[PDB]
Scaffold this motif. Structure first.
Motif, PDB file in Angstrom:
ATOM      1  N   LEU A   6       0.791  -1.173   0.253  1.00  0.00           N
ATOM      2  CA  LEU A   6       0.028   0.354  -0.089  1.00  0.00           C
ATOM      3  C   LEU A   6       1.036   1.245   0.157  1.00  0.00           C
ATOM      4  O   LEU A   6       0.444   2.142   0.878  1.00  0.00           O
ATOM      5  N   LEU A   7       2.010   1.106  -0.765  1.00  0.00           N
ATOM      6  CA  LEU A   7       2.749   2.405  -0.406  1.00  0.00           C
ATOM      7  C   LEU A   7       2.662   3.355  -0.937  1.00  0.00           C
ATOM      8  O   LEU A   7       3.292   4.281  -0.753  1.00  0.00           O
ATOM      9  N   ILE A   8       1.662   3.488  -1.921  1.00  0.00           N
ATOM     10  CA  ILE A   8       1.117   5.005  -2.020  1.00  0.00           C
ATOM     11  C   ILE A   8      -0.270   4.720  -1.563  1.00  0.00           C
ATOM     12  O   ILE A   8      -1.670   4.334  -1.601  1.00  0.00           O
ATOM     13  N   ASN A   9       0.099   5.971  -0.721  1.00  0.00           N
ATOM     14  CA  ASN A   9      -1.374   6.161   0.195  1.00  0.00           C
ATOM     15  C   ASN A   9      -2.756   7.143  -0.703  1.00  0.00           C
ATOM     16  O   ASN A   9      -2.517   8.101  -1.567  1.00  0.00           O
ATOM     17  N   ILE A  10      -3.048   6.402  -0.579  1.00  0.00           N
ATOM     18  CA  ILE A  10      -4.956   6.780  -1.263  1.00  0.00           C
ATOM     19  C   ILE A  10      -5.637   8.108  -0.806  1.00  0.00           C
ATOM     20  O   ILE A  10      -5.745   8.776  -2.276  1.00  0.00           O
ATOM     21  N   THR A  11      -5.358   8.373   0.292  1.00  0.00           N
ATOM     22  CA  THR A  11      -5.573   9.966   0.532  1.00  0.00           C
ATOM     23  C   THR A  11      -4.637  10.375  -0.212  1.00  0.00           C
ATOM     24  O   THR A  11      -5.206  11.942  -0.228  1.00  0.00           O
ATOM     25  N   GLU A  12      -3.634  10.882   0.178  1.00  0.00           N
ATOM     26  CA  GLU A  12      -2.345  11.410  -1.196  1.00  0.00           C
ATOM     27  C   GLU A  12      -2.701  10.992  -1.810  1.00  0.00           C
ATOM     28  O   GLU A  12      -2.851  12.219  -3.165  1.00  0.00           O
ATOM     29  N   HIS A  13      -3.730  10.170  -2.907  1.00  0.00           N
ATOM     30  CA  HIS A  13      -3.685  10.004  -4.441  1.00  0.00           C
ATOM     31  C   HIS A  13      -4.501  11.600  -4.816  1.00  0.00           C
ATOM     32  O   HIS A  13      -5.159  11.665  -3.695  1.00  0.00           O
ATOM     33  N   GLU A  14      -4.762  11.808  -5.770  1.00  0.00           N
ATOM     34  CA  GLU A  14      -5.455  13.597  -5.753  1.00  0.00           C
ATOM     35  C   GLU A  14      -6.890  12.588  -7.090  1.00  0.00           C
ATOM     36  O   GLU A  14      -6.912  13.351  -7.537  1.00  0.00           O
TER      37      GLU A  14
END
Lengths: 238, 1238, 60, 209, 81
Positions: free
Chosen positions: D134-142
């Motif tokens: 999950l190394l890229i955060n969905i809430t961080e995802h734009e």
């Protein structure tokens, strides 16, 4: 119903009388009339030619052939129309019956061979006076064997319910097949009388509910095949 | 008081079942057998017992035939028999009671499960029997964690036999009546725990009870020849021989199983259709012999009695009349062949109810199949005109497909006047012209009205005052138009006064109006102008009409300039003046496609022969080349049949040249030229298939494959592709074709016969399933949708609260400028640089809709953007008044305070009118919006696509995959960006980052092509190969880890010593394949798009393997723009509204193919339906685990089957209790407005 | 009989038994009823016998 | 293994740090925005090159919503996590009487210890997260709107203003990672402001169950 | 019952059309007849007479299952336009 020899299946829109149809100059007025809107998007150019070898085969006595991958080309037919007095293109020079002066743009003519199909509007006279829901098979007038008319099957009532108006749908419900206000309930009551149910005349269990006979047939046919018989009511008021 | 509010199936109420008992078994025979006659017998098949004949004493009902509701009666037989359904249940669940103890299901326990069961909804108690499915009777008797193990009993699946031994288990079985168990112990142990509803005890097949005789019809021939009935459960009366009395129970239940276990139409009519335009747009007409179809309530009123008696006296064989009239005393009397009546006491004889014919609407409905829109059945008028067609204003054939082969059509008759008035003034004038599914008019000049009106508009046509004749079918004309007409002035005063052709079109002189238009179907610059028509206030300044300026266009029409400003009732009455003005002009001008209309000159046939020579020459050059390759392909990638794309586009150049030669010398006084200059009938690629070059056909967006070996047709040469051996016709239908250009025509011709024949394969299911699954949607007045339990689906309609009904011109800031252009308040002039005056008007604006508020949240959200828009208008006006004025005052630069005030008032009007909830019925509209655009168009959208690879994958059938979210999807394609803004090499480095020699004998395993092949394919290492081969040394079979191999510069993978001397097999295969060369460890091929789009160079990764998080380490990335195309995977990998937006865009890729742009709010609503609970379970065609949705969709398994019977025998409820059942059940709807509670 | 015939109409022998009237015809747009493949067939040719029918049926 | 050590440090650091802002705590910015040389300053970029024992991340930094009692996080260097090492982590929690914590499943962690984390919650809410995944955060995802959470009193406020019961809103189950990044428990409502053009902010409310 | 604030200054078209329908039944049983009793005097067009009402002295009450009785007199608000 008409066909054309070119999958060009028109229908009698008007039926005009003789005196109103255009007459070329000789005296010929159409039997049929097409409009040049079936061609440019269907592209039957096997019809702008059949009217060349008709009017060139009769004006000369011939009896022409356009055969698959052979036939008779446009040039010889054009010259035939020339020899008996018309265009290369066989486009006549018509005046208009309605008002009595020349059409502004010329008018194609010549013999076609119209087939006359089955499936008319007299073998297709159908209408229904009333439809109740019966007791024998407990069905409304579905399709045939009761009358002609309609049959609101799958997609039909799918459209019917998809309107967007509340009691337009309510009216469709109330007029569908039947809405008998028969008396039935769960608390000592079944499909029977209203005022004094010989089934159970408890006098507190009178319902008189609108219901088509189909649900009652479901009740009956599922009596044999046991299933939870939920039955109850509720207030329309506050 | 109260009709049905909550009802389900019905059963045998034993009391009222058996008071109506008459006879169970009278004798060995029935049907009055022994009498040698048939008076009425025997007391059970007669009297009643369920009213299956003309008359007898109906029991608890009366009288015959209907309203004798099915009468009951004890016909008990007492044949020994047991629960076949619970025979199967006991066989399957293996003695769920734990007989013969029936001890408590749970012990202490953990009361956690106790309270969890006691505080949860139903349809769940099966888990207790699931826990005791096996452990039952094989456990410790009187112990903890359960109370079973008693008494060593498991059931055997010997068919319907239930043999229960004292099993070990699996060590005590016998063969012939020993070690058995009787269902009577099961019955006693009753005497998943709920005897309130789930009683298996009372279902014993010993007190069998019969459904009433209303199921069964008996066709008594009145001749004593055949009285068959079906089925039914009473038939076992003939088994009185065995009625006198473990394998015996099985035999008895086998004997039982033979006969124990397994809004259509009203007031209609159908004829053929051939219409008139003389029928005003709202009006329609029917045959005359539909008045001979009758029995109408039309309940008499006091003001009506005389007008009714006028027609009552007519009777059976007069059109305006009456027949079968329903009398006051409920005994209706006929005036048909037994009439001899109509004395008609003038106020009482029918003082309640009458029944006349179709005189004047009296609305009727018209049926069509398939009913694409809800606008395939609409409400429209009557009266009555003969010649039994289906005639109606021919401008509205589009939403019906009133096809003219002569194939018949269906008519309704509504005989109830309750919502008939409601129907006739809601879907009669607003349904026709404006659709929410598209926002585009359905009513339009179908055909020649287009070309007739066009020809009127043509700058040529000059008319006569004597040609006020054709005027007068329009505005001096049939009913409801005879005012005067202002005789548009003599628009020439030469030696020859003459009337131009335009303001003969623009003619009406009652209820003056105003309008505006632009942008017809032609080019730009005064270029022989057939565009920017620029209509002013009902005149016709410039231009010439078209299907996009007089027909079913989008924003410029005679509707969206005469429906909005000025209202309704002025659009349904300019269409009629066209319908009688224009097409009765052609009858004075004539169109006649001769042949010269489709003969190319013999002075530009050259441009086809020489291009044929050049084309065939270059194609032959390349086709020769692909054996030697001097040019060369490779590029292309591939290149075997990439001398396909080049030859495809060479023949495309050929046809484009040819076409453009088909459309230059055409002299403008031409037919089909004048049926494609005007969108009327056919296009510019049909004035080319009839002149120069009908080539090239295809098959599947690719030229004709073989089907003889390496050659398409045998009338050719082997292995030799060309523009002849693989279909390319080159003969225009004028000089028709050759028998190797016809048989490549009925194989792309057989697309439009297979396209339009498996179109109704997916749509026939998906339309009915979408309708069946999405009814409960309502629009209650809080601006919020609610569900079967009133669960919130939305709160606004996307901030605006708007829905596509009122989609006026661009919403509503550009067309309305024109609207107020056309009504000129002259007094004002540029003195003070009105920009500041415009700001003062912005101030009165700010005041004048801060009195906004009502049902609201629809104006403040856009009030400030309104202000910004008028501010930019003022800025533009300032620039104009400065530079342009740097004397007509520069046209006065019209803008006045009055105009802007009217402008803001119109803005408020349309913004507050387009407000849904209150209302609003948003659900089914969106359902069919997303549905039928899958049905209409598949032709010119998914096949151009002619012909190229590289990212054109799917169209309409992606709707199936989105709705179902099935895992068998063969395109799990996962798009994602990269180091996007780069060059081919710059992104190619990361592209490479995204991501074969002799095995030997004699103590050695293999090697690798570790040479520059990998160093030019992708950055890996021999050490990476060692690491990979270390991982389990195989897939799914126990190879080794072996710690480790590859002790050389190139791998020596050290086939592990033959401990399993069985196989060198795995030793070869497990290393042969790729281990570090898959790039995701479970994926198909990666993809690369080195493509120049959006101006710059884009670079993507069209990976085809689930799931997301595959893009963790794509150090590109571009992580912000990572996307997906599979709903259930993005459900867990990415966010919830992420999956909502992916579902929105997925169904908004199936509709970008040509034309179709369904409303975005519809897919927004569908996506809101997708994600009630957040965790995305999209609406599938089979069911969902989403309790706030409708439980009805769960039952629709396509379709109902034996599973419901099995659940019924288990006492399980049915989930058909939504609202689609309401139409079969006949009850009023209750949501939004049908829930009245004073 | 057909009048623009094909060498394969003869071979069927079913040009001794033609199936449709051979009709004079224009190409002409009368007045809004023609439109989507519809035909203004004049009377006084239905009257003079253009295109009768002899629909039989059968009761047994 | 710098070629992956560097990106591990970057992306795991950003995920956990903006999960601290997920609880609204200030972790000063210089810990968030850096360069590769600054991550070398962080850990040498190689305290675990090839998996030696690194300077354990083990944020163990109190949040701001709970600025006093206990808010800390672990990180196991073990590529796979077991029952006994999870006992080690929970006893490390016991050493300071924690309330919530965080165990990372680098590749795979045993199902028995999964059930342990299921059952050892009451003092230390622990989770089976593949947090190195999950190394890229969905809430961080734009592409996902902000999943702002509300407290129960505001839930009652809003559901009165729109006239709803607290069991009838749209929902968000805790299983989906949007409800795991915020670590949201039952009986709460999440605001998910859909991004658009006419207003750019269409507010929507989603329950937990 | 002064919970009448969440309706636009217009009744919806569905409600208006159905109240016209129920007024049709009213004036079609015997008479609630109004401002002009039968000034518009025509044969069997039951519906098309009370369409011309333009006053409509009757009350209708619109709801929501999780809400109270938002009541509305026909007089006190704007019409189909």
């Amino acid at each position: 119903k008409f066909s054309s020899r070119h999958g060009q299946k028109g229908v009698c829109g008007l039926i005009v009388p003789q005196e109103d149809m255009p007459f070329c100059d000789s005296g010929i007025c159409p039997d049929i009339i097409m409009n040049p809107h079936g061609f440019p998007s269907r592209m039957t150019v096997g019809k702008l030619i059949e009217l060349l070898a008709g009017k060139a085969g009769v004006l000369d006595g011939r009896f022409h052939y356009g055969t698959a991958f052979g036939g008779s080309k446009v040039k010889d037919v054009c010259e035939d129309l020339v020899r008996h007095g018309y265009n290369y293109l066989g486009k006549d020079y018509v005046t208009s019956g309605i008002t009595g002066e020349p059409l502004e743009a010329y008018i194609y003519f010549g013999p076609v061979y119209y087939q006359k199909l089955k499936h008319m509007v007299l073998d297709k006279m159908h209408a229904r006076a009333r439809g109740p829901r019966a007791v024998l098979t407990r069905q409304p007038t579905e399709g045939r064997s009761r009358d002609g008319g309609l049959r609101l099957g799958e997609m039909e009532r799918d459209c019917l319910i998809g309107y967007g108006a509340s009691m337009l749908l309510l009216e469709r419900l109330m007029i569908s097949s039947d809405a008998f206000e028969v008396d039935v309930c769960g608390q000592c009551g079944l499909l029977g009388y209203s005022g004094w149910c010989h089934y159970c005349k408890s006098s507190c269990h009178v319902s008189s509910l609108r219901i088509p006979y189909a649900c009652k047939l479901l009740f009956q046919e599922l009596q044999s095949m046991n299933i939870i018989p939920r039955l109850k009511l509720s207030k329309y008021n506050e | 008081a109260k009709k049905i509010s909550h009802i389900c199936f019905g059963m045998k109420s034993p009391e009222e079942m058996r008071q109506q008992a008459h006879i169970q078994v009278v004798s060995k025979n029935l049907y009055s057998q022994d009498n040698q006659h048939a008076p009425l017998l025997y007391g059970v098949l007669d009297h009643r017992m369920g009213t299956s004949e003309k008359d007898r004493p109906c029991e608890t009902c009366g009288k015959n035939l209907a309203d004798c509701l099915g009468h009951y009666g004890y016909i008990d037989l007492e044949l020994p028999c047991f629960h076949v359904g619970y025979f199967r249940a006991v066989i399957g669940i293996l003695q769920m009671i734990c007989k013969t103890c029936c001890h408590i299901m749970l012990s202490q326990e953990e009361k956690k499960q106790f309270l969890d069961y006691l505080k949860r909804p139903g349809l769940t108690y099966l888990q207790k029997r699931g826990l005791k499915k096996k452990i039952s009777d094989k456990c410790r008797k009187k112990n903890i964690c359960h109370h079973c193990g008693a008494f060593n009993g498991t059931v055997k699946k010997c068919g319907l036999l239930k043999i229960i031994h004292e099993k070990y288990k699996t060590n005590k079985k016998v063969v012939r009546a020993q070690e058995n168990l009787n269902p009577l112990v099961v019955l006693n142990l009753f005497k998943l725990m709920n005897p309130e509803a789930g009683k298996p005890s009372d279902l014993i097949l010993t007190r069998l009870l019969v459904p009433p005789l209303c199921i069964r019809p008996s066709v008594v021939s009145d001749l004593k020849s055949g009285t068959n009935e079906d089925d039914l459960t009473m038939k076992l009366t003939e088994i009185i021989f065995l009625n006198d009395v473990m394998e015996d129970w099985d035999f008895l239940q086998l004997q039982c199983a033979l006969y124990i276990n397994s809004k259509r139409v009203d007031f209609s009519g159908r004829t053929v259709i051939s219409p008139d335009p003389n029928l005003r747009i709202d009006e329609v007409a029917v045959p005359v012999h539909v008045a001979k179809i009758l029995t109408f309530p039309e309940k008499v009123n006091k003001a009506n009695i005389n007008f009714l008696r006028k027609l009552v006296q007519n009777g059976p064989e007069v059109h305006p009349g009456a027949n079968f009239i329903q009398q006051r005393h409920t005994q209706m009397k006929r005036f048909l062949k037994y009439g001899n009546r109509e004395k008609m006491a003038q106020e009482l004889k029918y003082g309640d109810i009458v029944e006349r014919h179709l005189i004047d609407g009296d609305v009727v409905l018209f049926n069509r199949q398939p009913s694409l829109h809800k606008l395939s059945i609409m409400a429209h008028l009557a009266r009555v005109k003969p010649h039994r067609t289906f005639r109606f204003n021919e401008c509205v054939c589009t939403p019906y497909n009133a096809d003219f082969d002569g194939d018949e059509m269906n008519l309704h008759l509504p005989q109830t006047e309750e919502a008939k008035a409601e129907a006739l003034v809601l879907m009669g004038t607003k349904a026709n012209l404006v659709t929410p599914r598209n926002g585009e008019p359905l009513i339009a000049a179908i055909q020649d009205f287009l070309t007739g009106a066009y020809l009127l508009t043509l700058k040529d046509t000059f008319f006569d005052r004597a040609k006020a004749c054709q005027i007068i079918a329009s505005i001096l004309v049939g009913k409801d138009e005879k005012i005067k007409v202002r005789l548009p002035p003599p628009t020439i005063l030469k030696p020859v006064t003459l009337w131009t052709g335009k303001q003969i079109f623009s003619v009406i002189l009652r209820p003056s109006d105003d309008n505006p238009v632009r942008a017809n179907l032609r080019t730009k610059g005064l270029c022989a102008n057939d565009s920017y028509v620029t209509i002013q206030n009902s005149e016709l300044m410039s231009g010439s009409m078209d299907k996009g300026t007089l027909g079913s266009g989008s924003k410029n029409n005679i509707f969206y300039i005469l429906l909005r400003d000025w209202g309704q009732n002025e659009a349904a009455d300019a269409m009629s003046r066209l319908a009688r003005l224009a097409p009765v002009y052609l009858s004075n001008r004539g169109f006649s496609i001769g042949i010269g209309d489709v003969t190319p000159g013999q002075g530009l046939l050259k441009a086809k022969y020489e291009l044929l020579n050049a084309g065939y020459k270059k194609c032959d050059e390349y086709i020769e080349a692909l054996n030697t390759g001097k040019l060369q392909q490779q590029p292309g990638c591939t290149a075997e049949e990439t001398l396909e794309a080049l030859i495809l586009k060479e023949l495309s150049v050929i046809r484009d040249h040819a076409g453009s030669a088909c459309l230059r010398e055409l002299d403008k006084s031409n037919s089909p030229l004048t049926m494609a200059l005007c969108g009327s009938k056919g296009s510019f690629i049909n004035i080319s298939q009839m002149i120069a070059c009908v080539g090239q056909q295809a098959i599947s967006g690719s030229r004709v494959p073989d089907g003889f070996e390496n050659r398409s047709l045998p009338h050719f040469e082997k292995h030799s592709k060309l523009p002849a051996a693989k279909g390319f016709v080159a003969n225009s239908f004028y000089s028709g074709l050759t028998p190797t250009e016809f048989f490549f025509h009925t194989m792309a011709g057989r697309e439009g016969l297979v396209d339009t024949a498996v179109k109704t394969a997916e749509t026939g299911y998906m339309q009915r399933r979408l309708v069946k699954s999405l009814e409960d949607l309502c629009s209650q007045y809080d601006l919020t949708v609610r569900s079967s339990t009133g669960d919130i689906i939305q709160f606004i309609y996307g901030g605006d609260g708007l829905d596509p009904a009122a989609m006026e011109g661009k919403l509503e800031f550009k067309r309305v400028l024109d609207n107020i252009k056309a009504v000129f308040p002259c007094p004002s002039e540029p003195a003070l640089s009105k920009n500041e005056l415009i700001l003062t008007t912005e101030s009165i604006m700010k005041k004048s809709e801060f009195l906004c508020c009502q049902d609201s949240f629809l104006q403040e959200i856009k009030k400030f953007i309104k202000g910004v828009s008028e501010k930019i208008k003022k800025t533009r006006d300032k620039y104009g008044i400065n530079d342009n004025g740097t004397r007509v005052l520069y046209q006065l630069d019209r803008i006045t305070p009055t105009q802007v005030e009217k402008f803001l008032e119109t803005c408020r009007d349309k913004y507050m009118r387009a407000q849904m909830e209150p209302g609003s019925a948003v659900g089914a509209l969106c359902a069919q919006s997303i549905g039928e655009p899958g049905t209409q168009m598949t032709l010119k959208t998914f096949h151009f696509a002619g012909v190229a690879s590289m990212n054109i994958t799917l169209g309409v059938p992606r709707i199936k995959e989105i709705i179902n979210a099935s895992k068998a999807i063969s395109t799990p394609i996962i798009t994602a960006q990269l180091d996007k803004d780069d060059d081919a090499d710059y992104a190619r480095l990361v592209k490479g980052r995204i991501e074969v020699f002799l095995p030997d004998d004699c103590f050695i395993l293999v090697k690798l092509s570790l040479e520059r092949i990998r160093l030019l394919r992708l950055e890996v290492n021999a050490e990476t190969v060692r690491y990979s081969i270390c991982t389990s040394k195989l897939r799914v079979k126990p190879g080794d880890v072996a710690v480790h191999g590859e002790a050389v510069v190139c791998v020596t993978p050290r086939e592990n010593s033959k401990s399993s001397m069985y196989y060198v097999l795995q030793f070869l295969k497990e290393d042969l394949p790729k281990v570090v060369v898959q790039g995701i460890p479970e994926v198909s091929r990666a993809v690369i798009h080195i493509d120049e789009q959006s101006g710059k160079e884009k670079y993507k990764l069209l990976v085809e393997g689930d799931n997301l998080r595959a893009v963790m380490a794509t150090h590109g990335v571009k992580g912000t723009r990572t996307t997906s195309n599979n709903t259930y995977e993005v459900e867990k990998t990415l966010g919830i509204e992420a999956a909502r937006t992916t579902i929105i865009n997925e169904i908004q890729y199936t509709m970008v193919n040509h034309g179709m742009s369904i409303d975005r709010r519809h897919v927004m609503l569908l996506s809101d339906l997708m994600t009630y609970k957040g965790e995305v379970l999209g609406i599938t065609r089979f069911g969902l685990a989403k309790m706030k949705e409708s439980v009805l969709m769960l039952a629709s398994f396509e379709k109902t089957a034996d599973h419901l019977f099995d659940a019924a025998y288990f006492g399980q409820k049915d989930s058909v209790c939504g609202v689609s059942e309401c139409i079969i059940m006949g009850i009023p709807m209750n949501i939004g407005t049908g829930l009245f509670k004073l | 009989k057909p009048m623009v015939k094909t060498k394969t109409i003869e071979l069927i022998e079913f040009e001794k038994l033609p199936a449709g009237q051979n009709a004079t015809v224009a190409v002409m747009s009368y007045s809004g009823y023609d439109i989507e493949d519809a035909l203004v067939l004049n009377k006084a040719s239905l009257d003079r016998g253009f295109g009768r029918c002899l629909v039989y049926k059968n009761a047994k | 293994d710098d070629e992956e050590e560097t990106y591990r440090l970057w992306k795991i650091r950003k995920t956990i740090m903006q999960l601290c802002h997920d609880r609204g705590y200030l972790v000063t910015q210089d810990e968030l925005d850096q360069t590769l040389e600054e991550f070398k300053a962080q850990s040498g970029d190689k305290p675990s090159e090839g998996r030696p024992r690194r300077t354990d991340l083990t944020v163990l930094v109190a949040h701001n919503d709970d600025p006093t009692d206990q808010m800390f996080v672990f990180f196991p260097e073990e590529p796979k996590v077991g029952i006994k090492t999870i006992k080690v982590y929970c006893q490390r929690m016991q050493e300071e009487n924690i309330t919530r914590a965080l165990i990372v499943v680098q590749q795979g962690m045993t199902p028995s210890a999964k059930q342990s984390l299921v059952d050892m919650a009451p003092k230390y809410i622990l989770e089976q997260f593949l947090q190195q995944e999950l190394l890229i955060n969905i809430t961080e995802h734009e592409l996902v709107p902000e999943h702002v959470v509300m407290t129960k009193e505001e839930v009652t406020e809003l559901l009165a203003r729109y006239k709803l019961r607290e069991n009838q809103l749209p929902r968000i189950q805790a299983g989906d990672p949007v409800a795991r990044y915020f670590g949201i428990k039952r009986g709460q409502v999440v605001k998910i402001i859909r991004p658009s053009e006419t207003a750019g902010r269409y507010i929507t409310y989603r329950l937990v169950q | 019952a002064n919970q009448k604030r969440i309706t636009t200054p217009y009744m919806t078209k569905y409600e208006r059309a159905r109240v016209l329908g129920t007024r049709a039944l009213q004036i079609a049983m015997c008479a609630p007849v109004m401002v002009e009793l039968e000034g518009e005097t025509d044969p069997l067009l039951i519906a098309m007479k009370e369409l011309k009402a333009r006053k409509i002295p009757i009350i209708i009450r619109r709801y929501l299952p999780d809400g109270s009785y938002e009541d509305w007199g026909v007089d006190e608000l704007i019409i189909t336009d």
